[PDB]
Design a protein around this ligand. Structure first.
Ligand SMILES: CCCCCCCCCCCCCCCCCC(=O)OC[C@H](COP(=O)([O-])OCC[N+](C)(C)C)OC(=O)CCCCCCCCCCCCCCCCC
Ligand SMILES: CCCCCCCCCCCCCCCCCC(=O)OC[C@H](COP(=O)([O-])OCC[N+](C)(C)C)OC(=O)CCCCCCCCCCCCCCCCC
Ligand SMILES: CCCCCCCCCCCCCCCCCC(=O)OC[C@H](COP(=O)([O-])OCC[N+](C)(C)C)OC(=O)CCCCCCCCCCCCCCCCC
Ligand SMILES: CCCCCCCCCCCCCCCCCC(=O)OC[C@H](COP(=O)(O)OCCN)OC(=O)CCCCCCCCCCCCCCCCC
Ligand SMILES: CCCCCCCCCCCCCCCCCC(=O)OC[C@H](COP(=O)(O)OCCN)OC(=O)CCCCCCCCCCCCCCCCC
Ligand SMILES: CCCCCCCCCCCCCCCCCC(=O)OC[C@H](COP(=O)(O)OCCN)OC(=O)CCCCCCCCCCCCCCCCC
Ligand SMILES: CCCCCCCCCCCCO[C@@H]1O[C@H](CO)[C@@H](O[C@H]2O[C@H](CO)[C@@H](O)[C@H](O)[C@H]2O)[C@H](O)[C@H]1O
Ligand SMILES: C/C=C(/C)[C@H](O)[C@H](C)/C=C(C)/C=C/C/C(C)=C/Cc1[nH]c(OC)c(OC)c(=O)c1C
Ligand code: SF4
Ligand code: SF4
Ligand code: SF4
Lengths: 318, 178, 51, 144, 156, 115, 44
């Protein structure tokens, strides 16, 4: 009965990941005054499945200069960590209930940067090495602020358990007492997931395709499934943390439906953002995060350390 | 007369009213929200797409497309092998041979257009004194081999008979501009 | 013109030819992502540059 | 209110193709279920519709026949299947359909259109249309 | 037979996936590449056929030769074509690519891209209108639809 | 045990898709296909040569700040102490010297990338 | 009578060409005032 419960997590997520590729191509379409896919199936609904099938019948590439062990490991790691980020998410009851879920999300997210690094390095190509060394630069940019932002929000929550955020937001979104951190949190998630205007590791304009330039076929498909799963998860995580869905102990179906509506809406804003802005320069990404966000995040960390103290609003341990 | 695109240094003083506006611009990302608005407005505009191949892009009667050899209303070929289309062709795309016919007429035994040399300039259409060679309105004639794009006389006369109904009306709509 | 109906010499002065030659100069102390911008700002079409 | 008018046009389009079979047939062949005015039809079976309230470029369109010249074109439709009389109207090179301004008849004009025959056994094959130029000597057929 | 029938429908299945996802390589040479950008523009929106431009030849299915191929660029065009994973298709677009075009007699031009790579579809014009290229692209999908790889494997 | 099961299931899917990708397609290997990519021309040198890091000082400053995260992450448990004055004073100082350290590096052109 | 394509008598109506990006939005104080209100109520 637990195996059936994995099915009803990993399969709906994978289906939802695929259609995000369709929603991306049609929202980008209509925002660009065109229609996006709409021939492959009714309104393109079969277009995601065509792309998947075609990619797994495409010849896979084994470049002569490549380090095969890491070349193969990297896409496999990418998609594993994308699916593993989901098992602790409470919706409103998580598949795996962890006391330090927030750290499991932080630690799993960091380890997924090594799929970019190892793949790029293992390709033994100049454009793939440029892409990898932007993954290093991008992580050094957003890592420090992203952890501290979480610390600030969790001092109103009382613990690193994700399931306790449901109870913190019983009467109010954390977005209100924390909208400065949500603004900084949201931009971090665009950097965490290599999403425009921060698609610097890929960055088709400057690097031909960045880290995955030497990847074709099914191995390259796994990288994308990982990229789009993370988009849903990071916005799903942002919905739990800051936009707490309605939770009634008698209507757990209500929390999921409301959780989905806000997660879909936030996922759309990622697609909305990609259609609206030019791409950052990856040196300027560091300056954004270290010279703007970091000074503000440290101050808000000190604000939220003191805030429960001088209002006697310390969250409970349990 | 000239104008400055990026000059504005008629420096004003930063009022507390104005400084707080600069800060809200920077902290609240206001100009970046304006850009999000412009792409949101486009989402609710009707797309400019047309439903090809069921809908077609507009064309004018002058459209320079696929070539064709025309006839007179009696069915006689208009081409008299004058070779002026050949002398003008910028691409040397036309090859012609001629001789007296069985009835003594001046007619071509060969007439080729290598449609892979052609630049579709329409100059042959202008040079022809009897409207024999024209560029019809067809543009959907891509092939699966190079050799199919070397048109000999039979092929070009067949295009003439295929498209005459439409060629004749386009000349009727445009010859007065020529 | 040599007096005939065919030109004797025809040299085209492509504006983009000298602009491309200034790409090196305009790109001192810039990153790869700026060379992408400097190429775009010069308005480069290679039909005229190469001929 | 306006939202209801929109659903009115939506219903009117869903039921305006003659049954469920009609709506599925048009929707999966053209991926479009608008309701134009039938302007005419050709000897091959293509139907020509128009709606002048649409913006220029979608105000005219064709639903290709499902069988032309013995070929099955229920799924394989290409723009070369429009004959030359409608080719001019469909491309907005004129303003009046052939049903009211027919082309001048000629005895050599093709009666039967022919679409792109590339890849098929009907495909054009180039060749030299001149005759031999140098004639060779023929030796005597007898001993000397 | 039953197996020979099943192989036929499996053939349609794999073809359909390749017909419905053609990813041309971001790659144009001269003025013909401007009309290829118009086919991507809103009016024609090739994306609605499942046609997405991808920069890397590893991720690309189709190479559209959209402009003149000079001798200096001939080896490089072949190299990016070799690096395309198979199956892979070439659309030759324009007179320059089709057979040299306006530069057929130039000392520096390859008289047709089909001396360098195998070409599937030839699109005439200088340039072909975006619809002409679109007709050619859709004529490549029908060519794939006629593919019979699995059935031929069965009869080997 | 559940958390071990769900992750093997994740790994097996990633493995299973990896095997299908390599043994399902029809592969035609030759030298010119499997060479490295570099925009159509041959690479002029291997990609394993040194690649100068213009942000190296920020890289090692990330390490120092990374460990200063490890000192602030116990705070959610620390605000449960009776010695609230002490907990708060230590917290304020810790964040303030991280800020003072950051200001010094910022003013020393330490955040600037080496040209 | 000569029939050539020409502009109508009087000419065509004026055509806008200058930049016309509107000035719009709340004041600096209103933005900050709302945000600081939202924090204060959230902290309470
Ligand atoms: C992974 C999920 C697979 C499900 C999708 C496979 C079905 C593909 C056919 C389809 O959906 O569209 C109808 C398609 C559409 O036809 P079409 O692709 O020729 O039409 C496209 C052109 N317009 C837009 C004008 C219509 O029908 C077919 O021709 C292909 C049928 C093949 C079905 C596969 C064999 C059965 C499976 C065993
Ligand atoms: C997502 C997964 C999508 C797959 C959906 C099922 C379709 C499987 C069809 C085979 C995949 C395509 C492989 C291919 O094109 O090669 C054809 C090959 C080529 O046939 P061949 O043996 O005649 O080719 C010989 C090599 N040449 C031509 C170069 C001389 O045919 C097969 O052997 C495929 C066998 C299909 C049996 C299904 C399991 C295969 C594993
Ligand atoms: C899903 C794909 C699994 C089925 C195909 C496995 C390919 C394979 O190993 O063939 C058996 C192998 C042959 O592997 P192979 O090299 O022919 O794999 C290629 C697969 N096709 C044919 C579809 C292109 O048989 C052996 O000789 C060793 C066992
Ligand atoms: C690459 C492979 C994927 C790597 C995944 C990395 C992320 C894993 C982080 C470690 C998970 C963790 O933090 O353990 C939490 C949990 C302990 O449970 P706890 O927090 O105390 O709450 C309930 C106790 N009553 O832990 C437990 O319940 C028991 C320990 C589980 C450890 C999970 C190990 C993952 C599987 C790795 C397999 C090897 C990969 C090859
Ligand atoms: C009671 C006590 C009150 C205590 C709390 C006080 C809080 C006050 C409010 C502070 C809000 C802080 C939010 C962060 C704002 C910020 O840092 O933005 C500035 C940043 C710098 O941009 P820059 O080019 O440098 O211009 C300024 C020159 N330094 O510019 C940027 O951030 C731009 C980043 C944009 C990247 C694109 C992201 C998409 C944006 C649209 C999504 C919107 C959702
Ligand atoms: C992210 C959360 C940060 C808070 C966002 C608040 C944005 C806002 O209040 O509106 C700003 C902007 C006004 O335009 P503005 O650049 O300020 O023009 C100068 C006027 N003093 O607002 C606008 O211009 C409206 C833009 C269109 C709105 C549609 C997008 C939603
Ligand atoms: C070199 C870096 C230095 C920069 C950083 C300096 C930080 C200094 C912070 C000083 C703030 C301490 O603020 C101090 O908080 C404590 C407890 O929180 C308050 O103390 C009060 O509350 C505590 C419990 O909370 C009671 O037990 C106590 O009897 C009462 O006095 C003090 O009244 C207040 O003055
Ligand atoms: C990003 C993805 C997409 C789908 C985009 O919408 C479109 C379709 C891709 C574009 C813009 C280019 C596609 C191919 C290519 C490399 C063209 C050559 C080119 N490119 C030019 O500029 C860009 C020129 O500028 C004067 C040129 O002369 C020439 C010759
Ligand atoms: S259109 Fe121009 S290039 Fe083509 S055959 Fe006529 S004259 Fe020659
Ligand atoms: S087509 Fe016209 S120009 Fe050419 S040879 Fe015939 S009559 Fe002369
Ligand atoms: S065929 Fe004509 S339009 Fe195309 S590249 Fe050559 S000259 Fe340019």
């Amino acid at each position: 009965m637990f195996f059936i419960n994995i099915l009803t997590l990993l399969v709906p997520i994978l289906i939802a990941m695929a259609f995000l590729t369709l929603v991306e191509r049609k929202i980008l379409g209509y925002m660009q005054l065109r229609k996006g896919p709409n021939i492959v199936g009714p309104y393109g609904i079969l277009q995601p499945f065509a792309d998947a099938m075609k990619l797994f019948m495409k010849e896979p590439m084994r470049p002569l200069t490549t380090s095969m062990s890491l070349f193969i490991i990297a896409p496999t790691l990418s998609l594993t960590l994308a699916l593993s980020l989901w098992v602790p998410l409470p919706m409103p009851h998580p598949l795996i209930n962890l006391n330090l879920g927030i750290l499991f999300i932080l630690a799993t997210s960091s380890l997924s940067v090594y799929s970019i690094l190892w793949s790029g390095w293992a390709s033994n190509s100049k454009y793939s090495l440029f892409g990898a060394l932007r993954a290093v630069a991008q992580t050094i940019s957003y890592e420090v602020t992203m952890a501290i932002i979480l610390l600030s929000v969790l001092l109103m929550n009382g613990s690193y358990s994700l399931q306790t955020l449901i109870t913190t937001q019983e009467h109010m979104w954390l977005l209100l007492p924390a909208w400065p951190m949500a603004m900084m949190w949201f931009i971090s998630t665009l950097a965490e997931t290599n999403r425009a205007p921060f698609d610097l590791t890929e960055g088709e304009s400057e690097l031909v395709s960045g880290f995955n330039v030497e990847y074709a076929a099914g191995p390259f498909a796994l990288f994308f499934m990982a990229e789009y799963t993370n988009i849903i998860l990071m916005n799903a995580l942002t919905t739990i943390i800051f936009l707490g869905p309605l939770y009634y102990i008698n209507l757990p179906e209500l929390y999921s439906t409301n959780f989905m509506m806000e997660a879909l809406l936030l996922s759309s804003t990622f697609l909305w953002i990609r259609a609206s802005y030019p791409r950052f320069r990856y040196d300027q990404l560091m300056h954004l995060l270290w010279k703007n966000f970091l000074p503000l995040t440290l101050a808000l960390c000190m604000w939220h350390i003191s805030l429960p103290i001088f209002t006697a609003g310390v969250p409970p341990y349990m | 007369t000239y104008k400055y695109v990026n000059k504005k240094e008629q420096e004003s003083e930063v009022d507390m009213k104005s400084a707080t506006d600069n800060a809200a611009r920077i902290l609240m990302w206001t100009e970046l929200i304006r850009g999000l608005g412009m792409t949101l407005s486009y989402l609710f505009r009707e797309p400019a797409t047309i439903n090809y191949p069921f809908e077609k892009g507009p064309l004018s009667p002058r459209f320079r497309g696929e070539h064709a050899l025309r006839r007179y209303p009696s069915g006689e070929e208009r081409c008299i092998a004058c070779k002026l289309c050949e002398a003008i062709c910028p691409a040397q795309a036309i090859t012609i041979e001629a001789e007296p016919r069985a009835d003594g007429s001046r007619r071509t035994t060969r007439y080729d257009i290598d449609m892979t040399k052609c630049i579709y300039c329409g100059f042959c259409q202008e040079a022809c004194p009897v409207d024999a060679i024209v560029e019809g309105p067809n543009f959907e004639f891509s092939t699966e081999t190079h050799e199919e794009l070397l048109y000999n006389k039979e092929k070009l006369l067949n295009n003439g008979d295929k498209w005459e109904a439409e060629i004749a009306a386009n000349i009727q709509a445009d010859y007065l501009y020529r | 013109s040599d007096g005939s109906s065919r030109p004797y010499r025809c040299k085209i002065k492509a504006p983009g030819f000298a602009h491309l030659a200034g790409l090196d100069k305009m790109s001192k102390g810039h990153m790869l992502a700026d060379v992408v911008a400097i190429i775009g700002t010069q308005d480069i079409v290679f039909g005229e540059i190469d001929r | 209110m306006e939202l209801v008018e929109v659903l009115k046009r939506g219903v009117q389009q869903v039921t305006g193709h003659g049954g469920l079979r009609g709506l599925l047939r048009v929707f999966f062949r053209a991926n479009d279920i608008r309701i134009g005015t039938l302007v005419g039809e050709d000897k091959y079976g293509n139907k020509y519709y128009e709606d002048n309230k649409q913006f220029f470029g979608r105000h005219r369109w064709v639903i290709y026949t499902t069988e032309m010249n013995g070929k099955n074109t229920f799924w394989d439709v290409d723009g070369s299947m429009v004959p030359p009389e409608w080719h001019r109207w469909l491309h907005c090179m004129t303003d009046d359909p052939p049903t009211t301004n027919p082309p001048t008849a000629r005895k050599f004009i093709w009666t039967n259109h022919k679409f792109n025959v590339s890849a098929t056994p009907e495909q054009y094959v180039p060749y030299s249309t001149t005759r031999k130029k140098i004639h060779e000597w023929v030796p005597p057929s007898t001993p000397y | 037979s039953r197996a020979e029938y099943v192989v036929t429908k499996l053939d349609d299945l794999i073809n359909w996936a390749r017909r419905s996802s053609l990813w041309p390589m971001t790659f144009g040479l001269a003025c013909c590449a401007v009309e290829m950008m118009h086919m991507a523009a809103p009016r024609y929106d090739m994306d609605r056929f499942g046609v997405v431009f991808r920069a890397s030849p590893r991720q690309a299915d189709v190479m559209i030769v959209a402009g003149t191929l000079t001798n200096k660029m001939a080896p490089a065009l072949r190299k990016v074509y070799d690096q395309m994973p198979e199956p892979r298709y070439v659309v030759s677009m324009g007179s320059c690519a089709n057979g040299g075009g306006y530069y057929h007699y130039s000392y520096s031009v390859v008289r047709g891209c089909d001396r360098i790579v195998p070409v599937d579809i030839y699109v005439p014009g200088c340039p072909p209108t975006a619809e002409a290229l679109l007709y050619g692209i859709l004529q490549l999908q029908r060519k794939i639809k006629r593919e019979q790889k699995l059935k031929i494997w069965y009869r080997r | 045990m559940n958390l071990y099961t769900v992750i093997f299931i994740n790994i097996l899917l990633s493995l299973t898709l990896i095997l299908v990708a390599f043994w399902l397609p029809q592969m035609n290997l030759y030298s010119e296909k499997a060479n490295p990519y570099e925009c159509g021309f041959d690479p002029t040198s291997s990609a394993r040569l040194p690649f100068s890091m213009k942000f190296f000082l920020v890289a090692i400053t990330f390490l120092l700040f990374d460990l200063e995260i490890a000192l602030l992450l116990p705070l959610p448990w620390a605000i449960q102490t009776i010695k609230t004055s002490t907990m708060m004073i230590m917290a304020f100082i810790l964040v303030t010297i991280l800020s003072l350290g950051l200001a010094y590096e910022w003013t020393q052109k330490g955040l600037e990338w080496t040209e | 009578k000569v029939k050539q394509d020409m502009p109508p008598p009087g000419g065509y109506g004026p055509i806008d060409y200058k930049r016309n990006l509107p000035r719009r939005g709340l004041s600096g104080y209103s933005m900050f005032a709302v945000g600081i209100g939202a924090l204060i109520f959230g902290y309470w």
